[PDB]
Amino acid sequence: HNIMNTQLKRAESEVAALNRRIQLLEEDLERSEERLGSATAKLSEASQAADESERARKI
Amino acid sequence: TQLKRAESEVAALNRRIQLLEEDLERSEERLGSATAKLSEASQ
């Protein structure tokens, strides 16, 4: 006589699976933001080097 | 040059974060509706 509790038990596991998916997405987002800060700094250093090099190439 | 590789990695990371944030937003509204309806079905 638990067919009424299987409804709240299936909905509880859907909530737990959604919490697990949210946690996995936030960890991927956190690591992607760390690499984006690493890549944005490398893009600035390389764009500054390309700008400071061509700026010196004058007549 | 080394700049074409830096712009591609930044653009690829910006696209991944955008798609991850869209999944996160859709998962949060699905979670908020699942818990609000589960608490309604409880005493």
Side-chain angles (χ1 to χ4, degrees), chain A residues 1-6 8 11-41 43-44 46-54 56-59, chain B residues 1-3 6-43:
Chain A
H1 202 42
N2 209 63
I3 204 161
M4 195 267 177
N5 277 5
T6 67
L8 253 68
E12 267 173 328
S13 267
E14 175 201 44
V15 166
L18 272 173
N19 283 307
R20 179 55 171 157
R21 179 195 187 92
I22 284 172
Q23 173 194 29
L24 291 172
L25 293 164
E26 289 176 335
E27 293 167 342
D28 194 6
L29 270 163
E30 173 75 16
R31 190 168 29 249
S32 307
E33 288 281 355
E34 291 275 9
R35 297 166 57 208
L36 183 66
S38 267
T40 305
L43 175 58
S44 266
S47 147
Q48 257 174 255
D51 272 8
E52 77 173 3
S53 148
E54 217 279 325
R57 303 320 121 84
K58 296 152 290 169
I59 307 177
Chain B
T1 325
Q2 78 177 1
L3 208 79
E7 299 173 319
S8 51
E9 173 94 20
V10 159
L13 282 166
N14 276 311
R15 182 56 174 176
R16 177 180 196 86
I17 286 162
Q18 177 104 34
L19 293 162
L20 283 171
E21 290 282 353
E22 277 165 5
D23 199 346
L24 182 53
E25 174 199 85
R26 294 187 307 252
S27 302
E28 286 282 353
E29 62 163 309
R30 276 166 64 221
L31 170 78
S33 89
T35 70
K37 203 249 160 159
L38 174 127
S39 156
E40 184 148 277
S42 320
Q43 50 266 6

